[PDB]
């Protein structure tokens, strides 16, 4: 297991996280060297959740507000933080190169807090942002142009948050959602798709690891056709379409979850939702978090999407 996930499974249905995942401290002061300023704001102390804001330095040299991206990190629902270095650095790159202010949500982790805990934290964060008088948000973020985004498990959260938000869109004002960005979103199912068969022996996400992730994340005794795991009447898509939200879906052929991501994109398209799909040859799951060239290329497409 340690070859794939930095966890130990205990004989009491719990896990242990014995390998520290590096984190980066916030840097709120523009006299620092950072090209992006960051600070953490407590969300809910009973859930120990917080939000890290990323404000690109370039925003301090004009009086224009930038679109706001509400972001959810990946990690199988079971690992990582908004302050994990790999996610902090991606968000700093994204802020600079897509020209956005980011609010990255530190949601509760499974199995201590199985789904839907992370989705509830996503909605709490939206409610909190809408009501916020934080000075970075009020002076530099455009509440009228908000995007919900996430990577891997966080893209699953972003998708479920997007469905819930669409149902309460009027209630979220002054925040106006304009789109969803689903970066290699994590979905599953009881039956294997073709890509799950083709990539069963993947070097990072083989079948048994994916199955473990769902086992630890879904409600006890659910199976992988549970709606949190397998997203595909999709009446919700009528609301997305009616609100005029655009949806970006990205992924690559070397990710075992590609077939489900592509099926979601096709179902959205079938329901008349404005979809921007970029599915690439090759790669592997989370390659953009490791490959600065692939990240660079994605930021080109995200900049245009957000504009």
- Residue whose pair of structure tokens reads 């669409």 in the numeric block: 166
Query: d(Cα 179, Cα 148) in Å, to the nearest integer?
Result: 7
DSSP E strands in the chain: the ranges are 8-9, 15-16, 36-44, 49-56, 66-72, 101-106, 141-151, 177-183, 246-252, 274-280
For residue 141, give every residue at least 6 positions away whose Cβ sits within 8 Å of its Cβ, in sequence order, or none: 65, 66, 67, 68, 101
Task: Write the CA distances from 220 to 11, 113, 258, 268, integer angstroms.
Answer: 16, 11, 26, 30
Residues contributing to the annotated binding site: 75-76, 152-153
Given phi > 0 = left and psi -120 to 50 = alpha, else beta, which region is 99? left
Given phi > 0 = left and psi -120 to 50 = alpha, else beta, which region is 184? left
Is 307:105 a contact under the CB 8 Å cutoff? no
Is 78:7 a contact under the CB 8 Å cutoff? yes
Resolution in angstrom units: 1.4
* Helix and strand element counts for the chain (H, E): 10, 10
3-state helix, strand, coil in the chain (%, to 5): 35, 20, 40
Query: d(Cα 266, Cα 268) in Å, to the nearest integer?
Result: 5
The total domain count for the chain is: 1
Active site residue 255: yes
Q: Which domain holds residue 108?
A: 1-307
Per the structure block, which two tokens stand in for 202? 């993947």
Per the structure block, which two tokens stand in for 266? 């096709």
Q: What is the DSSP letter of 84?
A: B
Is 37:88 a contact under the CB 8 Å cutoff? no
Task: Write the CA distances from 130 to 80, 144, 268, integer angstroms.
Answer: 25, 10, 27
CA atoms within 13 A on the CB side of 9: 11
Per the structure block, which two tokens stand in for 159? 């998708």
Is 23:81 a contact under the CB 8 Å cutoff? yes
- Which residues share a beta bridge with 180? 148, 247
Q: CA angle, corner 196, sides to 190 and 197, nearest 5?
A: 105
Per the structure block, which two tokens stand in for 229? 């795991």
**Residues 106, 183, 202, 255: which is the catalytic one?**
255
Active site residue 152: yes
Query: d(Cα 159, Cα 135) in Å, to the nearest integer?
Result: 28
Residues contributing to the annotated binding site for paraoxon: 75-76, 152-153
> What CATH number is associated with residue 62?
3.40.50.1820
Is 303:268 a contact under the CB 8 Å cutoff? no
**Residues 152, 195, 217, 236: which is the catalytic one?**
152
CA neighbor of 59 nearest in space, from 102, 106, 104, 27:
102
Query: d(Cα 158, Cα 82) in Å, to the nearest integer?
Result: 14
CA neighbor of 180 nearest in space, from 225, 218, 212, 149:
149
Active site residue 285: yes
Cα dihedral sign, 94-96-100-101:
positive
Per the structure block, which two tokens stand in for 6? 């930095």
DSSP E strands in 87-139: the ranges are 101-106
């Amino acid at each position: 297991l340690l070859k794939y996930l930095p966890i130990v499974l205990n004989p009491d249905r719990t896990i242990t996280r014995p390998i520290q995942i590096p984190s980066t401290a916030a840097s709120p002061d523009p006299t620092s060297s950072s090209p992006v300023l960051t600070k953490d704001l407590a969300l809910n102390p009973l859930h120990n959740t917080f939000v890290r804001l990323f404000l690109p330095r370039h925003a301090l040299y004009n009086s224009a507000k930038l679109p706001l991206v509400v972001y959810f990190h990946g990690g199988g629902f079971i690992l990582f933080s908004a302050a994990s270095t790999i996610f902090h650095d991606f968000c700093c790159e994204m802020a600079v190169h897509a020209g956005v202010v980011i609010a990255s949500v530190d949601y509760r982790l499974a199995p201590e807090h199985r789904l839907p805990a992370a989705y509830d934290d996503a909605m709490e964060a939206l409610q909190w942002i809408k009501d916020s008088r934080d000075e970075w948000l009020t002076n530099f973020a455009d509440f009228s142009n908000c995007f919900i985004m996430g990577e891997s498990a966080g893209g699953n959260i972003a998708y479920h948050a997007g469905l819930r938000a669409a149902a309460v869109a009027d209630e979220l004002l002054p925040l106006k959602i304009k789109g969803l960005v689903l970066d290699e979103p994590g979905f599953g199912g009881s039956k294997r798709t073709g890509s799950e068969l083709r990539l069963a022996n993947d070097s990072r996400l083989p079948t048994f690891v994916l199955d473990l992730i769902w086992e630890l994340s879904l409600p006890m005794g659910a199976d992988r056709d549970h709606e949190y795991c397998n997203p595909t009447p999709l009446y919700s898509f009528d609301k997305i379409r009616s609100l005029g939200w655009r949806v970006m879906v990205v992924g690559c052929h070397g990710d075992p979850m590609i077939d489900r991501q592509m099926e979601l994109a096709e179902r959205l398209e079938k329901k008349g939702v404005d979809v921007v799909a970029q599915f690439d040859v090759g790669g592997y799951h989370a390659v953009k978090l490791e490959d600065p060239e692939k990240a660079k290329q994605f930021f080109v497409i995200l900049k245009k999407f957000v504009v």
